[PDB]
From Swiss-Prot, chain A:
Keywords: Acetylation, Proteasome. This is 26S proteasome non-ATPase regulatory subunit 13. GO terms for cellular component: cytosol; extracellular region; ficolin-1-rich granule lumen; membrane; nucleoplasm; nucleus; proteasome accessory complex; proteasome complex. The keyword Metal-binding does not apply. Belongs to the proteasome subunit S11 family. Component of the 19S proteasome regulatory particle complex. The 26S proteasome consists of a 20S core particle (CP) and two 19S regulatory subunits (RP). The regulatory particle is made of a lid composed of 9 subunits including PSMD13, a base containing 6 ATPases and few additional components. One of its GO terms (biological process) is meiosis I. The modification N6-acetyllysine is found at K15. It comes from the Eukaryota. It comes from Homo sapiens (Human). GO terms for molecular function: structural molecule activity. Component of the 26S proteasome, a multiprotein complex involved in the ATP-dependent degradation of ubiquitinated proteins. This complex plays a key role in the maintenance of protein homeostasis by removing misfolded or damaged proteins, which could impair cellular functions, and by removing proteins whose functions are no longer required. Therefore, the proteasome participates in numerous cellular processes, including cell cycle progression, apoptosis, or DNA damage repair. The keyword Amino-acid biosynthesis does not apply.
Swiss-Prot record, chain D:
This is 26S proteasome non-ATPase regulatory subunit 11. Coiled coil: none annotated. Phosphorylated by AMPK. Belongs to the proteasome subunit S9 family. Induction: By FOXO4; expression in embryonic stem cells (ESCs) is mediated by FOXO4. It comes from Homo sapiens (Human). The chain holds residues 368 to 422 of 422 of the full protein. Component of the 19S proteasome regulatory particle complex. The 26S proteasome consists of a 20S core particle (CP) and two 19S regulatory subunits (RP). The regulatory particle is made of a lid composed of 9 subunits including PSMD11, a base containing 6 ATPases and few additional components.
Curated annotation (Swiss-Prot), chain G:
It comes from Homo sapiens. It comes from the Eukaryota. This is 26S proteasome regulatory subunit 6B. Component of the 26S proteasome, a multiprotein complex involved in the ATP-dependent degradation of ubiquitinated proteins. This complex plays a key role in the maintenance of protein homeostasis by removing misfolded or damaged proteins, which could impair cellular functions, and by removing proteins whose functions are no longer required. Therefore, the proteasome participates in numerous cellular processes, including cell cycle progression, apoptosis, or DNA damage repair. Belongs to the AAA ATPase family. It is found in: Cytoplasm; Nucleus. Component of the 19S proteasome regulatory particle complex. The 26S proteasome consists of a 20S core particle (CP) and two 19S regulatory subunits (RP). The regulatory particle is made of a lid composed of 9 subunits, a base containing 6 ATPases including PSMC4 and few additional components. Interacts with NR1I3. Interacts with PAAF1. Interacts with TRIM5. Interacts with ZFAND1. Signal peptide: none annotated. The gene is PSMC4.
Swiss-Prot record, chain I:
It comes from Homo sapiens (Human). Disulfide bonds: none annotated. The gene is SEM1. One of its GO terms (cellular component) is nucleoplasm. It is found in: Nucleus. GO terms for biological process: double-strand break repair via homologous recombination; mRNA export from nucleus; proteasome assembly; proteasome-mediated ubiquitin-dependent protein catabolic process. Keywords: Nucleus, Proteasome. The keyword Nuclease does not apply. This is 26S proteasome complex subunit SEM1. PANTHER family: 26 PROTEASOME COMPLEX SUBUNIT DSS1, 26S PROTEASOME COMPLEX SUBUNIT SEM1. Expressed in limb bud, craniofacial primordia and skin. Component of the 19S proteasome regulatory particle complex. The 26S proteasome consists of a 20S core particle (CP) and two 19S regulatory subunits (RP). The regulatory particle is made of a lid composed of 9 subunits including SEM1, a base containing 6 ATPases and few additional components. Belongs to the TREX-2 complex (transcription and export complex 2), composed of at least ENY2, GANP, PCID2, SEM1, and either centrin CETN2 or CETN3. Component of the homologous recombination repair (HR) complex composed of ERCC5/XPG, BRCA2, PALB2, DSS1 and RAD51. Interacts with the C-terminal of BRCA2. Belongs to the DSS1/SEM1 family.
Amino acid sequence: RPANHRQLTFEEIAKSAKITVNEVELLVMKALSVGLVKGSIDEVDKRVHMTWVQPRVLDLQQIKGMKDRLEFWCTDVKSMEMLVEHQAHDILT
Amino acid sequence: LEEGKAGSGLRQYYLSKIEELQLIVNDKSQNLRRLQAQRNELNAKVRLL
Amino acid sequence: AVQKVVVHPLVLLSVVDHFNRIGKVGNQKRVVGVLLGSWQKKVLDVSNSFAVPFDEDDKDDSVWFLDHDYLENMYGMFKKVNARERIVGWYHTGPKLHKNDIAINELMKRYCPNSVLVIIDVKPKDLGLPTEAYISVEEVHDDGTPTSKTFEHVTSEIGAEEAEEVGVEHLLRDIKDTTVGTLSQRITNQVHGLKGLNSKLLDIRSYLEKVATGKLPINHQIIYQLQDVFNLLPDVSLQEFVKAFYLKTNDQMVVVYLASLIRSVVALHNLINNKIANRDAEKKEG
Amino acid sequence: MILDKKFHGILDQGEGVLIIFDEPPVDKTYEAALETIQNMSKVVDSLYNKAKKLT
Amino acid sequence: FLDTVSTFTSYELMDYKTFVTYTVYVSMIALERPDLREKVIKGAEILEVLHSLPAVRQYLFSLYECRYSVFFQSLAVVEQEMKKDWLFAPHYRYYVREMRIHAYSQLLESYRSLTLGYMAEAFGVGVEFIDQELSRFIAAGRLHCKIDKVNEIVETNRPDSKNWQYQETIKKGDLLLNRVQKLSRVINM
Amino acid sequence: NYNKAVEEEDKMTPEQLAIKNVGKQDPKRHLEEHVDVLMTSNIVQCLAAMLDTVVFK
Amino acid sequence: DLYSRYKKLQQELEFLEVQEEYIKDEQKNLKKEFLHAQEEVKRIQSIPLVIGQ
Amino acid sequence: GFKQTVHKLLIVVELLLGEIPDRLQFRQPSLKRSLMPYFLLTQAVRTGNLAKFNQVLDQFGEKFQADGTYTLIIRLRHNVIKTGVRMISLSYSRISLADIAQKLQLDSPEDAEFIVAKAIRDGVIEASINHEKGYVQSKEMIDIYSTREPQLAFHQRISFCLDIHNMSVKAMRFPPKSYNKDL
Amino acid sequence: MSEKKQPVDLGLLEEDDEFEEFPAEDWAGLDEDEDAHVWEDNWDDDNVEDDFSNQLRAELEKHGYKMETS
């Protein structure tokens, strides 16, 4: 999930790793000890917030989604350029 | 009749109001060209510098 | 080793001379010039350069023609008249990096020290910076491919020290200086979207083309860092930055009070002289 | 000592909650307010010169 | 009254003890804690003249000490002495209210939330009177933000620094806006 | 600080302007410098839309 | 002459109206030249210099 | 001499909202004598005593009630309780059945919450209607927009103030043109 | 127009003809204690003054009796 409330909870980690709730702190502590993730969570109730990570293998749905979000960013920057520059060039030049 | 004095009369009065709009454009050209003479005289003054 | 380089416009105007002394023959190939500079300091500073007759073959790309006697004679006389600058590298005017450039650069890697490579465009239609410093160093690859010459992009800047700024400014008489204020800022704020639009739009099309229609590994490993950094800004909800909008908007309010108050101070002399001058000139005119 | 303003803090009786905060940008509202107060005399004096020359 | 060092017994207008007795009201009420600590508490003049009457020392150390249990018991002498004076009687209504709101702002300054028990025991008065007191001092007094009684506890917020410190100039911005509208009225006429 | 540092003299200007009104003796204009100060102050306004574009897309 | 003053005057309407964008060009360009020459005479003043009395 | 009508009607329509600003910054012996009969009632609005001030109005009321059709004063006679309950909105949250109901000269459970609800349906105040044990509570949050959506709060303030000050900039650009027009 | 002020000034002349110097002197009994005083503060002092004119004017002498009873 790149966007749309990336914030998560320990229920998915404990459910996918069939581990108890007492060992998830040592699990994320080892995850931060390896150095592949820099995630620091300011939570009060148990939550899992993550940061920069590298796939390093492959992702085709992220290639197609990369084209979708990339084309969306490009057409939004183009839309703002035509919008601001449209009347801005006519009134200021 | 009563057109050249009334119809063309109010048309001529509207032409006088058009002369008032050309008096606003006229004196705007006058003061804008006098300020243009001020900036031209100052930039020409530093050109003399 | 080298973090940044400095390229003076004199060598690029010498490329204008490369396009001037052609003679209308119909070749206009990638004429290679002998780049000169100061390799002593960590930063690279190009002062001037010269050229050498360079001709390739139509079909075979591996054909390249250089000269050692002309290089040692032009460099010997140039060192005799100015010994503060020595050989550093070369540069070609071709827009595309050919395979033969490893053999062309290899000669100045053997005889001369590590040469920097600069790719420019034959037509000044590219809005981006025409100069790209490509260092000729061999790098170890993680995939296991054999070690080969790699051209890493080194940042470059176009600056003049003492006189070329004056000569360019006198020859142009059209360009403007920094001139902080309305025009120099709003022009950048208008055309900047096209300055990024032509680059990104010009790159991601051939990029997306080489995604599906690509082979001969293009270093797909760096694409993971590409999309990674692109996904390092996952559409922040702006919840925490609201107070920052209150700070920047409060500074906006400060500019509002400064503009209204200061302009209200400027209205003094105008809204006084308009009366005291008109009524006195009118009452004293006749 | 909070009434003496020796440090940042505030007491409480019902809940006993302690809160510590500060306001660094003090030099903005002072200079702005002084510019407003000083410009009031400018506009008022302008209305005195124009009110004198007109009526 | 800062030049009280050079003052002396002047039988022409007012005695020295009457001058101190008259300036102790404007100094005791018209000044805050830093102004008193800087002017009078640091000065030795009130330290010399406090030995004449022991009441003034009680009205200074009790007010500066924030002890309302004795200040309200002894405030009746300030009430009766405040009136029946030549020049000081017609202003007796302003000193009372101004001193009460000044003390309420003094105690309420360093206190964010306040229960009715510690307040009633501190002031030594019933809650039925402070109810209408603060009720009248929210709109009439205009000292702090709105007060709530959902838990029967005096709880204020006072966001008067961060945003209101910048919003103190909007009044001069609106009055200056009407003044430059008058400047627009001067145009052509 | 420069704006107020000139306004402290602009408080004294309406006295001379309220006394003589004839001739100019001070070579300082007190106007174009403040115009330039406003031009330097408009960078916040011109770049606020830039931050709006960077935050938007 | 009476009715000809309208259409004859329209030529003066166009001749005076055409000066608007012209004085716009002059007032927008001559101040750019004013800051050009202003910065040109400003950059003449250099820091390295001799101090007299 | 003429502003006593726009000022008189001004304060007459201002006391309807519960907050009546009197004559503070203007010193002239015309609005004083004009306001002398109206001063007792315009001061009696805030305290809001129904039975006494109802007789006080018609007691000495000659000119302000002889002005015609007694429309806004016959609306004020029942607006006293609305400005008073608006002062209650400026007062504490909890509403008692004896203390504040007896204080407001209205001692009954139905019309208390009924008329207070008639003050809630206006929209000028903020309250939280909750019924747990029979008492009517209210949150009465009158906290200003400080650190509560400020950009949307004073956004229109910045736009409008820059529009008025900017047309004032036009009002300091055009008169110089009307100055240099003749020379 | 400035010509409509005449009947309003006539109404002011009628108000002045109702009582001849009666409100000037009777109100001057308080104005002699209000003269030269800032009238901005007289709105609050007159607000609480007229508010307490009916009952509990001083009330400070009664707190000493209200301490033990409340």
